[PDB]
Short mmCIF file of C-alpha atoms and ligand atoms in Angstrom, two decimals:
data_model
loop_
_atom_site.label_atom_id
_atom_site.label_comp_id
_atom_site.label_asym_id
_atom_site.label_seq_id
_atom_site.Cartn_x
_atom_site.Cartn_y
_atom_site.Cartn_z
CA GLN A 1 18.75 16.82 -6.99
CA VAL A 2 15.62 15.58 -5.23
CA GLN A 3 14.00 13.18 -7.58
CA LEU A 4 11.20 10.66 -8.00
CA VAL A 5 12.11 8.27 -10.81
CA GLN A 6 9.45 6.08 -12.40
CA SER A 7 9.69 3.21 -14.93
CA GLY A 8 9.14 3.22 -18.51
CA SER A 9 5.88 3.00 -20.66
CA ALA A 10 3.75 -0.26 -20.80
CA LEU A 11 1.79 -2.00 -23.59
CA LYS A 12 -0.47 -4.69 -22.08
CA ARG A 13 -3.54 -6.86 -23.08
CA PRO A 14 -6.77 -6.62 -21.21
CA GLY A 15 -6.79 -8.84 -18.07
CA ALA A 16 -3.02 -8.63 -17.80
CA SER A 17 -0.99 -6.99 -14.94
CA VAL A 18 1.63 -4.38 -15.05
CA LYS A 19 4.26 -3.52 -12.36
CA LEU A 20 5.14 0.32 -12.16
CA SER A 21 7.98 1.39 -9.91
CA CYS A 22 8.59 4.78 -8.44
CA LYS A 23 12.25 5.08 -7.21
CA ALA A 24 12.94 7.93 -4.79
CA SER A 25 16.50 9.54 -4.80
CA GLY A 26 17.76 12.54 -3.16
CA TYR A 27 15.97 12.51 0.28
CA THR A 28 15.21 10.17 3.15
CA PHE A 29 12.44 7.82 1.81
CA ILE A 30 10.75 6.98 5.24
CA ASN A 31 10.06 10.65 6.22
CA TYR A 32 7.65 11.53 3.34
CA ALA A 33 4.73 9.92 2.05
CA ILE A 34 4.08 8.79 -1.55
CA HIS A 35 0.85 9.62 -3.55
CA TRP A 36 -0.27 8.17 -6.94
CA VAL A 37 -2.14 10.30 -9.41
CA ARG A 38 -3.83 9.07 -12.48
CA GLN A 39 -4.40 11.25 -15.54
CA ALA A 40 -6.17 9.85 -18.36
CA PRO A 41 -5.32 11.53 -21.92
CA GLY A 42 -7.44 14.58 -22.54
CA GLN A 43 -8.70 14.35 -18.89
CA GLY A 44 -7.98 15.98 -15.62
CA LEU A 45 -5.73 14.69 -12.76
CA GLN A 46 -7.49 12.16 -10.61
CA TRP A 47 -6.40 10.91 -7.19
CA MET A 48 -5.74 7.16 -6.76
CA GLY A 49 -4.51 7.11 -3.10
CA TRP A 50 -1.30 7.03 -1.11
CA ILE A 51 0.97 4.69 0.87
CA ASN A 52 2.83 5.39 4.06
CA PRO A 53 6.72 4.60 3.97
CA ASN A 54 7.09 4.38 7.86
CA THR A 55 3.78 2.37 8.53
CA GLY A 56 3.24 0.63 5.28
CA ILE A 57 -0.57 1.12 5.14
CA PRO A 58 -2.00 1.76 1.69
CA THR A 59 -5.15 3.94 1.24
CA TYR A 60 -7.28 4.13 -1.78
CA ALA A 61 -9.66 6.33 -3.44
CA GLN A 62 -13.39 5.79 -4.15
CA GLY A 63 -12.94 4.22 -7.54
CA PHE A 64 -9.39 2.59 -7.28
CA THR A 65 -10.40 -0.09 -4.83
CA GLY A 66 -9.63 -3.81 -5.73
CA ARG A 67 -7.77 -3.74 -9.01
CA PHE A 68 -5.14 -1.23 -7.70
CA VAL A 69 -2.68 -2.43 -5.01
CA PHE A 70 0.22 -0.06 -3.58
CA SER A 71 3.39 -1.65 -2.12
CA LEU A 72 7.00 -0.42 -1.46
CA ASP A 73 10.41 -1.65 -0.61
CA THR A 74 11.98 0.52 2.14
CA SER A 75 15.61 -0.42 1.73
CA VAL A 76 16.04 0.18 -2.05
CA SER A 77 13.84 3.34 -1.43
CA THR A 78 11.09 2.71 -4.10
CA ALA A 79 7.24 2.35 -4.26
CA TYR A 80 5.07 0.13 -6.48
CA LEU A 81 1.76 -0.24 -7.88
CA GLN A 82 -0.28 -3.40 -8.96
CA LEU A 83 -2.62 -2.88 -11.90
CA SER A 84 -4.13 -6.41 -11.63
CA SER A 85 -7.03 -7.22 -14.26
CA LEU A 86 -6.33 -4.52 -16.71
CA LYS A 87 -9.37 -3.37 -18.60
CA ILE A 88 -9.72 -1.13 -21.75
CA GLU A 89 -10.66 2.04 -19.89
CA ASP A 90 -7.16 2.09 -17.82
CA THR A 91 -5.25 3.71 -20.59
CA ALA A 92 -3.75 6.57 -18.51
CA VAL A 93 -0.77 8.19 -17.29
CA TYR A 94 0.21 7.23 -13.74
CA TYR A 95 2.24 9.59 -11.68
CA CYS A 96 3.85 9.12 -8.28
CA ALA A 97 4.01 12.23 -6.08
CA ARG A 98 5.97 13.25 -2.78
CA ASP A 99 4.27 15.08 0.03
CA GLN A 100 5.57 18.45 1.20
CA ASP A 101 4.61 17.89 4.81
CA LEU A 102 2.38 15.64 7.16
CA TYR A 103 -0.47 18.13 7.14
CA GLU A 104 0.26 20.13 4.01
CA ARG A 105 -0.39 17.49 1.33
CA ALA A 106 0.69 19.64 -1.72
CA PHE A 107 2.66 17.38 -4.16
CA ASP A 108 5.86 19.22 -4.44
CA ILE A 109 8.07 16.59 -6.25
CA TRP A 110 6.38 14.55 -8.96
CA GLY A 111 7.41 11.40 -10.95
CA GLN A 112 7.94 11.28 -14.67
CA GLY A 113 4.68 9.50 -15.54
CA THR A 114 4.40 5.84 -16.92
CA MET A 115 1.95 5.72 -20.08
CA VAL A 116 0.17 2.51 -19.32
CA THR A 117 -1.44 1.83 -22.75
CA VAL A 118 -3.73 -1.20 -22.78
CA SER A 119 -5.63 -2.46 -25.89
CA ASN B 1 -29.94 18.01 3.00
CA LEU B 2 -27.41 15.72 4.65
CA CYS B 3 -25.62 16.73 7.65
CA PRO B 4 -21.81 17.61 7.29
CA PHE B 5 -20.46 14.53 9.04
CA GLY B 6 -17.97 14.27 6.17
CA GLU B 7 -16.08 17.40 7.10
CA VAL B 8 -15.69 16.31 10.75
CA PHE B 9 -14.53 12.81 10.27
CA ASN B 10 -12.30 13.39 7.07
CA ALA B 11 -10.40 16.50 8.03
CA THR B 12 -6.60 16.29 7.35
CA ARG B 13 -5.55 18.27 10.51
CA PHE B 14 -7.50 17.72 13.76
CA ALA B 15 -7.09 20.22 16.57
CA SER B 16 -5.20 19.71 19.72
CA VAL B 17 -7.05 18.65 22.94
CA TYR B 18 -6.50 21.92 24.72
CA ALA B 19 -8.07 23.86 21.86
CA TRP B 20 -10.61 21.19 20.78
CA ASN B 21 -12.70 22.06 17.78
CA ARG B 22 -16.45 22.55 17.86
CA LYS B 23 -19.01 22.43 15.02
CA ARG B 24 -22.63 23.16 15.15
CA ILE B 25 -24.55 20.74 13.26
CA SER B 26 -28.16 21.94 12.52
CA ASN B 27 -31.00 22.12 9.96
CA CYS B 28 -30.03 18.91 8.06
CA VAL B 29 -30.85 15.09 8.01
CA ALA B 30 -28.30 12.96 9.76
CA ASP B 31 -27.65 9.43 8.95
CA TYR B 32 -25.88 7.70 11.78
CA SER B 33 -26.00 4.06 10.37
CA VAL B 34 -23.33 4.87 7.87
CA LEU B 35 -21.04 5.68 11.02
CA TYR B 36 -22.14 2.59 12.92
CA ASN B 37 -21.57 0.31 9.83
CA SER B 38 -18.05 1.78 9.04
CA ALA B 39 -15.63 -0.83 10.65
CA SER B 40 -13.09 1.83 10.95
CA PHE B 41 -13.66 3.20 14.58
CA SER B 42 -12.03 1.39 17.73
CA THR B 43 -14.55 3.13 20.14
CA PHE B 44 -18.08 3.88 19.54
CA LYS B 45 -19.47 3.71 23.03
CA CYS B 46 -22.67 5.61 23.25
CA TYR B 47 -24.25 7.07 26.31
CA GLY B 48 -27.74 8.05 26.83
CA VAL B 49 -29.06 6.74 23.58
CA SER B 50 -28.52 3.54 21.72
CA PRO B 51 -26.60 3.55 18.42
CA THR B 52 -28.89 1.17 16.57
CA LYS B 53 -31.93 3.53 17.30
CA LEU B 54 -29.90 6.77 16.54
CA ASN B 55 -31.24 7.05 12.91
CA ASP B 56 -34.91 7.53 14.11
CA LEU B 57 -34.58 10.43 16.57
CA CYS B 58 -34.73 13.90 16.09
CA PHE B 59 -32.29 16.42 18.13
CA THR B 60 -32.33 20.26 18.55
CA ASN B 61 -28.69 20.97 18.24
CA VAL B 62 -25.83 18.62 17.57
CA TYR B 63 -22.22 19.60 18.58
CA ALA B 64 -19.19 17.59 17.09
CA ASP B 65 -15.96 18.04 19.08
CA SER B 66 -12.81 16.78 17.41
CA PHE B 67 -9.28 16.58 19.08
CA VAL B 68 -6.31 14.27 19.09
CA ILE B 69 -5.26 12.43 22.20
CA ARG B 70 -2.86 9.64 23.16
CA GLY B 71 -4.02 6.03 22.60
CA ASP B 72 -4.04 5.20 26.46
CA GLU B 73 -6.22 8.13 27.15
CA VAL B 74 -9.37 7.32 25.11
CA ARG B 75 -10.98 5.94 28.38
CA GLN B 76 -10.88 9.43 29.86
CA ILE B 77 -13.30 10.68 27.32
CA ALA B 78 -16.35 9.28 29.16
CA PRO B 79 -18.81 10.74 31.55
CA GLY B 80 -17.47 11.13 35.21
CA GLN B 81 -13.75 10.11 34.60
CA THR B 82 -10.46 11.34 36.06
CA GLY B 83 -7.10 11.85 34.40
CA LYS B 84 -5.05 14.62 32.86
CA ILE B 85 -7.34 14.92 29.76
CA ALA B 86 -10.58 14.91 31.60
CA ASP B 87 -9.36 17.50 34.24
CA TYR B 88 -7.40 20.07 32.13
CA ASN B 89 -8.34 19.64 28.47
CA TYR B 90 -11.87 18.05 27.82
CA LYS B 91 -14.50 17.36 30.61
CA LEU B 92 -17.74 15.55 29.75
CA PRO B 93 -20.73 16.08 32.15
CA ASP B 94 -22.17 13.22 34.00
CA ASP B 95 -25.66 13.65 32.54
CA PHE B 96 -24.17 13.27 28.96
CA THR B 97 -26.10 12.37 25.94
CA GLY B 98 -24.61 12.28 22.66
CA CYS B 99 -21.56 9.99 22.04
CA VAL B 100 -17.78 9.64 21.42
CA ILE B 101 -16.12 8.11 18.34
CA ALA B 102 -12.33 7.25 18.25
CA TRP B 103 -10.27 5.40 15.70
CA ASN B 104 -6.55 4.90 15.37
CA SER B 105 -4.62 7.47 13.39
CA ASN B 106 -1.11 6.46 13.52
CA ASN B 107 -1.31 6.47 9.68
CA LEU B 108 -1.91 10.31 9.83
CA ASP B 109 -0.58 11.89 12.85
CA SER B 110 2.77 10.13 13.37
CA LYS B 111 6.06 11.51 12.08
CA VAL B 112 9.57 9.88 12.36
CA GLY B 113 11.47 11.87 14.83
CA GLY B 114 8.43 13.19 16.84
CA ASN B 115 5.04 14.86 15.71
CA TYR B 116 5.17 17.79 18.19
CA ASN B 117 2.05 19.40 16.67
CA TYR B 118 -0.56 18.23 19.22
CA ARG B 119 -0.39 19.75 22.70
CA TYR B 120 -2.24 18.78 25.93
CA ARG B 121 -2.74 20.91 28.92
CA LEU B 122 -0.66 19.47 31.76
CA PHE B 123 -0.87 22.13 34.56
CA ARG B 124 -4.10 24.15 35.39
CA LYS B 125 -5.10 25.55 38.80
CA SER B 126 -8.50 23.81 39.04
CA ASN B 127 -10.45 20.94 37.30
CA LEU B 128 -12.47 22.00 34.17
CA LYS B 129 -16.22 22.65 34.00
CA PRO B 130 -17.93 20.42 31.41
CA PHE B 131 -17.73 21.53 27.79
CA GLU B 132 -15.24 24.26 28.77
CA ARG B 133 -11.82 24.91 26.88
CA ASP B 134 -8.78 26.83 28.20
CA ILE B 135 -6.72 28.07 25.25
CA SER B 136 -4.77 30.53 27.30
CA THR B 137 -1.03 29.90 27.88
CA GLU B 138 0.11 31.42 31.21
CA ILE B 139 2.82 30.09 33.53
CA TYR B 140 1.73 27.84 36.52
CA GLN B 141 1.86 27.69 40.16
CA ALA B 142 4.57 30.12 41.51
CA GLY B 143 4.37 28.66 44.99
CA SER B 144 7.52 30.71 45.80
CA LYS B 145 8.22 34.32 44.23
CA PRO B 146 6.42 34.88 40.99
CA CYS B 147 7.52 33.69 37.64
CA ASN B 148 7.23 37.22 36.19
CA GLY B 149 6.64 35.66 32.67
CA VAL B 150 9.95 33.58 32.85
CA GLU B 151 9.95 29.81 33.04
CA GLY B 152 12.49 27.80 34.92
CA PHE B 153 12.94 26.10 38.33
CA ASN B 154 9.41 25.98 40.09
CA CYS B 155 7.58 27.85 37.37
CA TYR B 156 6.02 25.58 34.74
CA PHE B 157 4.71 25.94 31.35
CA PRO B 158 1.20 24.60 31.20
CA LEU B 159 1.18 22.97 27.64
CA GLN B 160 3.13 19.71 26.97
CA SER B 161 3.60 18.56 23.42
CA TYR B 162 2.58 15.09 22.31
CA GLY B 163 5.39 12.98 20.83
CA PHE B 164 3.82 10.79 18.11
CA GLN B 165 6.23 8.23 16.34
CA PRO B 166 5.31 5.25 14.26
CA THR B 167 7.22 2.89 16.47
CA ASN B 168 5.27 3.70 19.61
CA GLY B 169 3.09 1.01 21.19
CA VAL B 170 -0.69 1.09 21.16
CA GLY B 171 -1.29 3.50 23.73
CA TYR B 172 1.28 6.08 22.85
CA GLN B 173 -0.10 6.09 19.09
CA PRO B 174 -2.38 9.05 18.35
CA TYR B 175 -6.17 8.71 18.34
CA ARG B 176 -8.53 10.91 16.65
CA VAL B 177 -11.67 11.55 18.89
CA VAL B 178 -15.01 12.87 17.74
CA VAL B 179 -17.45 13.59 20.46
CA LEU B 180 -21.11 13.89 19.18
CA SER B 181 -23.25 15.88 21.79
CA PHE B 182 -27.16 15.96 21.27
CA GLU B 183 -29.79 18.00 22.81
CA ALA B 184 -35.86 19.77 16.43
CA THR B 185 -33.64 20.41 13.63
CA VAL B 186 -31.40 17.36 13.02
CA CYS B 187 -33.45 14.26 12.09
CA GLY B 188 -32.70 11.09 10.47
CA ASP C 1 -15.86 14.26 -1.49
CA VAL C 2 -15.15 17.93 -1.92
CA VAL C 3 -15.99 18.82 -5.58
CA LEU C 4 -13.77 21.47 -6.62
CA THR C 5 -14.95 23.41 -9.77
CA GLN C 6 -12.82 25.68 -12.01
CA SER C 7 -14.36 28.53 -14.06
CA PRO C 8 -13.73 29.06 -16.87
CA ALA C 9 -12.71 25.72 -18.54
CA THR C 10 -10.36 27.81 -20.74
CA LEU C 11 -9.40 31.35 -20.62
CA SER C 12 -7.74 33.52 -23.44
CA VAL C 13 -5.77 36.66 -22.25
CA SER C 14 -3.19 38.64 -24.29
CA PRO C 15 0.49 38.24 -23.53
CA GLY C 16 0.95 40.76 -20.64
CA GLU C 17 -2.35 41.25 -18.90
CA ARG C 18 -3.70 39.76 -15.67
CA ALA C 19 -5.09 36.23 -15.82
CA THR C 20 -7.37 35.15 -12.91
CA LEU C 21 -8.37 31.50 -12.37
CA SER C 22 -11.05 30.81 -10.09
CA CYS C 23 -11.44 27.57 -8.22
CA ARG C 24 -14.72 27.25 -6.13
CA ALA C 25 -14.91 24.43 -3.61
CA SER C 26 -17.89 22.40 -2.56
CA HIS C 27 -17.03 22.75 1.05
CA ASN C 28 -15.10 25.21 2.96
CA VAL C 29 -11.51 24.11 2.68
CA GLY C 30 -10.17 26.82 4.74
CA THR C 31 -6.80 28.03 3.23
CA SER C 32 -5.60 24.58 2.37
CA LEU C 33 -5.71 24.56 -1.50
CA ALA C 34 -2.80 23.95 -3.82
CA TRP C 35 -2.18 25.14 -7.40
CA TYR C 36 -0.46 23.03 -10.04
CA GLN C 37 0.81 23.72 -13.50
CA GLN C 38 0.82 20.82 -15.96
CA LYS C 39 2.73 22.00 -18.87
CA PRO C 40 1.62 19.82 -22.11
CA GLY C 41 3.74 16.58 -22.06
CA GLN C 42 5.20 17.04 -18.50
CA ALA C 43 4.48 16.18 -14.96
CA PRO C 44 2.34 18.71 -12.95
CA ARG C 45 4.35 21.17 -11.02
CA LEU C 46 3.38 22.63 -7.71
CA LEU C 47 3.05 26.48 -7.62
CA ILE C 48 1.38 27.74 -4.46
CA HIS C 49 1.06 25.42 -1.41
CA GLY C 50 -1.46 27.56 0.51
CA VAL C 51 -2.20 31.25 -0.13
CA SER C 52 1.11 32.66 1.17
CA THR C 53 3.75 30.01 0.26
CA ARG C 54 5.08 29.69 -3.14
CA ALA C 55 7.13 26.82 -4.34
CA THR C 56 11.06 26.71 -5.20
CA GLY C 57 11.73 27.74 -8.59
CA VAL C 58 8.39 29.33 -9.38
CA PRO C 59 8.34 32.79 -10.73
CA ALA C 60 7.21 35.59 -8.70
CA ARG C 61 4.39 36.69 -10.99
CA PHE C 62 2.18 33.88 -9.72
CA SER C 63 0.14 34.98 -6.68
CA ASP C 64 -2.85 33.32 -4.81
CA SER C 65 -5.81 34.88 -3.05
CA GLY C 66 -9.09 33.89 -1.42
CA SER C 67 -9.90 31.59 1.32
CA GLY C 68 -12.86 29.32 2.21
CA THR C 69 -15.02 28.39 -0.84
CA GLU C 70 -13.42 30.94 -3.28
CA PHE C 71 -9.79 30.78 -4.62
CA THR C 72 -8.22 32.78 -7.41
CA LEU C 73 -4.83 32.31 -8.95
CA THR C 74 -3.74 35.46 -10.42
CA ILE C 75 -0.82 35.65 -12.83
CA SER C 76 0.42 39.15 -13.13
CA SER C 77 2.18 39.50 -16.38
CA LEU C 78 1.65 36.45 -18.58
CA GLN C 79 4.80 35.17 -20.33
CA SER C 80 5.03 32.44 -23.13
CA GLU C 81 6.22 29.92 -20.78
CA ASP C 82 3.19 29.94 -18.56
CA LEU C 83 0.77 28.39 -20.97
CA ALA C 84 -0.60 25.26 -19.23
CA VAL C 85 -3.48 23.63 -17.42
CA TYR C 86 -3.66 24.77 -13.79
CA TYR C 87 -5.34 22.34 -11.38
CA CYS C 88 -6.48 23.24 -7.96
CA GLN C 89 -6.28 20.67 -5.24
CA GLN C 90 -7.80 20.87 -1.85
CA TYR C 91 -6.12 18.97 1.05
CA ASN C 92 -8.35 20.05 3.88
CA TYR C 93 -10.43 16.77 3.72
CA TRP C 94 -9.69 13.31 2.93
CA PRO C 95 -9.74 12.17 -0.05
CA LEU C 96 -7.64 14.70 -1.85
CA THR C 97 -9.44 16.11 -4.78
CA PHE C 98 -8.32 17.83 -7.85
CA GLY C 99 -10.09 20.35 -9.99
CA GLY C 100 -11.00 20.15 -13.73
CA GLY C 101 -8.16 22.32 -14.87
CA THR C 102 -8.05 25.47 -16.88
CA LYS C 103 -6.17 25.69 -20.23
CA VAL C 104 -4.66 29.08 -20.39
CA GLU C 105 -4.24 30.39 -23.99
CA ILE C 106 -2.81 33.44 -25.49
C1 LIG D 201 -15.61 11.40 3.89
O1 LIG D 201 -15.25 10.20 3.55
C2 LIG D 201 -16.22 9.31 3.12
C3 LIG D 201 -15.48 7.93 2.97
O2 LIG D 201 -14.57 7.95 1.94
C4 LIG D 201 -16.91 9.83 1.80
O3 LIG D 201 -18.11 8.90 1.74
C5 LIG D 201 -18.22 8.66 0.38
O4 LIG D 201 -19.12 9.59 -0.23
C6 LIG D 201 -19.44 9.46 -1.54
C7 LIG D 201 -20.19 10.64 -2.07
O5 LIG D 201 -20.82 11.39 -0.73
C8 LIG D 201 -20.13 8.10 -1.97
O6 LIG D 201 -20.23 7.97 -3.33
C9 LIG D 201 -21.55 7.65 -3.62
O7 LIG D 201 -21.60 6.20 -3.77
C10 LIG D 201 -22.79 5.73 -4.13
C11 LIG D 201 -22.98 4.13 -4.21
O8 LIG D 201 -21.58 3.74 -4.88
C12 LIG D 201 -23.43 6.12 -5.50
O9 LIG D 201 -24.81 5.63 -5.80
C13 LIG D 201 -23.27 7.82 -5.48
O10 LIG D 201 -23.79 8.29 -6.67
C14 LIG D 201 -22.03 8.28 -4.98
O11 LIG D 201 -21.07 8.04 -6.00
C15 LIG D 201 -19.27 7.07 -1.43
O12 LIG D 201 -19.78 5.80 -1.56
C16 LIG D 201 -18.81 7.36 0.28
N1 LIG D 201 -18.09 6.22 0.64
C17 LIG D 201 -18.13 5.66 1.79
C18 LIG D 201 -17.18 4.64 2.19
O13 LIG D 201 -18.93 6.03 2.64
C19 LIG D 201 -17.40 11.32 2.21
O14 LIG D 201 -17.92 11.78 1.08
C20 LIG D 201 -16.31 12.09 2.58
N2 LIG D 201 -16.80 13.46 2.77
C21 LIG D 201 -16.04 14.54 2.23
C22 LIG D 201 -16.63 15.82 2.58
O15 LIG D 201 -15.06 14.46 1.73
#
């Protein structure tokens, strides 16, 4: 089974940091890109950015610059995300997604979502 | 009424250099300082106009031509140059106003195993006229007895596929080239 | 960015009639627009990549149409397992932009 397995939930304080892993199993990790999508509760999906497995370059959206840092470890086939300096309005579900193709960026295989609740 | 520079520079799939795209930019307000002060482009050499005074002029029609070439071939996107891109794919005239934007896109156009999506014309009977494209796919010379629609020895297919891999050096890495061509409808 | 607007915000159709879900794009995204299905609680699930290609494991009732700045997702016969929030996503231009979603209700 092709899968993207994420970590568990989180309960942090404002100003803290949380480390969310997204482990890829069932496919060759370097061939396909990893995209991070954030969904606030009672709100639509909202794209954060992506990271290249075979180049290592992260790319961020318009709002998710600064506090949010993507990273990955190629050998154990997983991708991470730094939420440095958590604020109150970051309570959201954070998905990791897999790209169908290089030019067909439709997220065919998703993660399970890590509910980062901050208060 | 901003000019749609954001759908020329942001497109996910650029076109190959043999079938290079072309966009009419007209009847809008163009801000060129946001492209100068972007710190993303490896090449923004401008010919016939200075880039710091680009936000004050007014042009009649603006063409934006986008294609992907090799990294060691962005020098051929220049007025009066010679190569296999300027001869057979994309020729710029000598009296060329408007200018050329290139940035590295190894993050976007490189695939492990070979990204054979972009093709460049390798073999064509004559050099290209300026701002002319040749999307036809027909077999080359037949100096001997004709090809008859079949490839092989001494009959060559004109289009050669680029191979882009992330392990290539800077020069085999894919570069995304945008060629603005100027002349009033497009002001600053 | 390419603002993708979905009308209506919610639609109610009886269990068995055609439901059409419109997604209007700010710019011409070509035919590069994916349709997702987020059932409540689960991850979003890809349905149609571009207007021809359907996903793996998707029912055959889901059909896409339209190109340019007007895209409709048409469910032929609504079941009880197709009650979710459907997001359209363009991928013609960076950054990739999602829609607002359309809560389909019986
Ligand atoms: C193509 O990509 C560029 C770069 O990502 C996009 O430029 C961005 O455009 C948006 C809206 O046009 C800008 O947002 C604006 O920011 C100002 C200042 O924060 C704010 O006052 C406005 O209300 C608006 O939110 C954004 O700053 C700008 N980013 C950069 C780096 O220039 C462009 O929109 C993309 N085009 C398409 C068609 O996707």
